[PDB]
Amino acid sequence: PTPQSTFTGPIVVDPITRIEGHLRIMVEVENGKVKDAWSSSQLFRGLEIILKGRDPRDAQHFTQRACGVCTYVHALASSRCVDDAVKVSIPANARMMRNLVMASQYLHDHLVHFYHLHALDWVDVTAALKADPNKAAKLAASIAPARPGNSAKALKAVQDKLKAFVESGQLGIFTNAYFLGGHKAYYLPPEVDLIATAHYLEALHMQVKAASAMAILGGKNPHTQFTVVGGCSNYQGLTKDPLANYLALSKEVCQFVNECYIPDLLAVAGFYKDWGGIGGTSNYLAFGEFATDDSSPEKHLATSQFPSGVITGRDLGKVDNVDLGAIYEDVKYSWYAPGGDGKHPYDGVTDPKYTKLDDKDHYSWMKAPRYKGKAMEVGPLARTFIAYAKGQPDFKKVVDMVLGKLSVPATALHSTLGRTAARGIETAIVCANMEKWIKEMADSGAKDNTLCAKWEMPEESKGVGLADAPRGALSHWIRIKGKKIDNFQLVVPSTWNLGPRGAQGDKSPVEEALIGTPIADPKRPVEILRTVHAFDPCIACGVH
Amino acid sequence: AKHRPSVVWLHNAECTGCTEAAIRTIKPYIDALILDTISLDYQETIMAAAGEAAEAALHQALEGKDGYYLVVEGGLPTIDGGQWGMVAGHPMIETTKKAAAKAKGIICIGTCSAYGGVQKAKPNPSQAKGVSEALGVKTINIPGCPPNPINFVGAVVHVLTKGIPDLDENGRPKLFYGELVHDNCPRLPHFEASEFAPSFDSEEAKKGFCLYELGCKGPVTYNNCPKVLFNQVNWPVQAGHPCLGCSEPDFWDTMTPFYEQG
Ligand code: SF4
Ligand code: SF4
Ligand code: FCO
Ligand code: F3S
Ligand SMILES: [Mg+2]
Ligand code: NI
Known about the structure:
The structure holds two protein chains of two kinds. By secondary structure, chain A is α+β, with helices and mostly antiparallel strands. Chain A has helices at residues 47-51, 59-63, 73-85, 92-118, 133-141, 152-167, 190-218, 240-271, 297-303, 380-389, 393-406, 416-447, 493-498, 509-514, 526-534, 539-543, and strands at 9-13, 23-30, 33-41, 227-228, 231-232, 284-286, 289-291, 304-306, 309-311, 327-330, 368-371, 460-469, 472-481, 484-491. Chain A has one domain (1-544): Cytochrome-c3 Hydrogenase, chain B. Chain A has 16 helices and 14 strands. In chain A, a hairpin with a 2-residue loop joins strand 4 (227-228) and strand 5. Chain B has two domains: 1-176, Rossmann fold, CATH 3.40.50; 177-261, Irregular (Cytochrome-c3 Hydrogenase, Chain A, domain 2), CATH 4.10.480. Chain B contains twelve helices and nine strands. The chains are: A alpha+beta, B alpha/beta. Bound molecules: iron/sulfur cluster (SF4) (2 copies), carbonmonoxide-(dicyano) iron (FCO), FE3-S4 cluster, magnesium ion and nickel (II) ion (NI). One iron/sulfur cluster binds at residues 181-182, 185, 187-188, 191, 210-212, 216, 218-219, 237, 243 of chain B. Chain A: Ca(2+) binds at residues 48, 490, 544. Chain A: Ni(2+) binds at residues 67, 70, 538, 541.
């Protein structure tokens, strides 16, 4: 069964490594199981305060720096936000190019997350040295497609590289790893660790290609520079040779997704089936992404190919429509001044006020986003459930392929294992659509190269820009006054997922998912990391 | 066999775009770099250890017998004794100060660590500062938001094999920052001829005319973007968008509004 100690007391993990930003997690453990938790964000920058009084056209360039991991997504949200405020509808080619760059971001972001941020919570790299390459090559034939990088020869070279590294005594990024000398919560046999490790190194090279594909349309990665009010500036991105290169690179990345990422994910989930009953939550929100009509926020919600919606109490039989007026942020348990609770983003208030470390009344720089008083999980799992419930064909096939492979019910997905599987699921679906989306833009741009519409700056107005970034529902809200930024508020996926308690003391998704976490070894609490990393935390995003 | 020089990489007030930029290197790739060339001994984004185990890894690295080089990403929030930016319960200013003290060299990756960056922009609510200003020490600056991996890895390799490179008035290596973006721009003939796009939808824009009227800061920005490109495929102006001047100090306040020359 699931290794669990008898430990009773507190555990603090700071810093949480292998995420973006600065997170501090506190838990109370009783008999080897978490009974209470706190998600404490440790850095404030204040982009919302900085944008006040500035040119609305500049907003996208400031907000993109909210995060360099989910690069682009904020530039996109700000562009959509300001496009809505000036009431301009972007040309079809601009919609297509914007959505493709988002698709490329999904591929890059999820590949890096699984291998470079999450995998070391499930894979014991040092145990890879115990593996027999020939036995690993044979096992690789029984869990994944045939490929030269999985040969005994290739796996031996990886092992030999790793052995020389470890024998140097300079363990670098592996220094003091929780898996050193063995750990009861790590289940994988040495043969699987070796396979996973070879792919870890391959992903380091593959992510460089995924970034190149994105830069063809985006100008550069990190931090794209091709979006403008009314559309895009990259005319070259509509031409033949650049889009042929974009397809070739994308096809390489997708081959890696199907040959390595999904198979590695499935193997790992197969060994850790017990994690299908740990770390689940109940409410899911998604604004949707990849819309066929982005002429307004309403059209975005309704035409997103990855559907938008709201699920409550795990009821996959009732997907409600998103009510953008029902969103608000609380600050009761956050480091902000009193009187800022229950604010809708259009009326958002960012007034920083610090108290002290581990103050149970004020313990995070993140605000607490709530929907009609309920905490909402956002991200790949939310999107997957919403799409599955609505019978989205691509999601039904893939979710069912995963359930059929793991021999588990769909309810097993309400968990840390499901959350991890969901991220892989949508990566596979984006991959399946790349060739279709690229062809649509190629044909359109060849026919007519309009890429940016005409518009006018209003004296006064407001707007909202919606997006479903790799981590979930993203929204930028602007109030324009005197042709300037009067108020600008960001409500980011990691704010929904990892923020603190709301005005009712109600736990956030991550705090709630941490309850019931078994702790095999209090000194090396990998289980806490597994669940937290499953949400793919981005703290600079969360706080901005 | 051969001892690899120890590198400590700290994250302060940053977006992690600089870390992301670094792993985009292809000469060499990041794995070859950390397996063969250096010993990356602390890096929160990718290191296996967490919490106290990670803090111990840092302190083991700072006490290493063979010394270490320091890379700093992000600015330093100084308001309220530095408490708006913490790691392991310590103010970022305090941890960087401690690590800078015995460093063989200090490299600031990104405009944030070099000059203060985005959080420093008016009204600067966290009273953020660049490393050199906050610590009172000279630093090797590799600015840009984020800088090109060719520039960062180039500087690291240079520092470990040839010593400190020649630096400009702003601490930037002349090897990479000795030319204006504008001087190597393929649209320079349009500029000379006064052929400016008046808007992004215009035929002038479709014809690839100079973007100066649209705010391009290339003429006052030192970087190698048009020469080396990003991701081996593109750069902003090639993508039809003006340069924001992201490698210049306080560009957030000196280069805005981005779409104007005023
Ligand atoms: S310099 Fe730019 S890319 Fe690098 S950390 Fe700062 S904001 Fe992020
Ligand atoms: S686009 Fe910018 S860098 Fe290129 S020539 Fe015109 S002003 Fe100079
Ligand atoms: N994905 C992503 Fe970043 C977060 N959280 C944003 O938006
Ligand atoms: S915006 Fe920055 S990346 Fe180069 S093109 Fe201008 S210096
Ligand atoms: Mg906000
Ligand atoms: Ni992010």
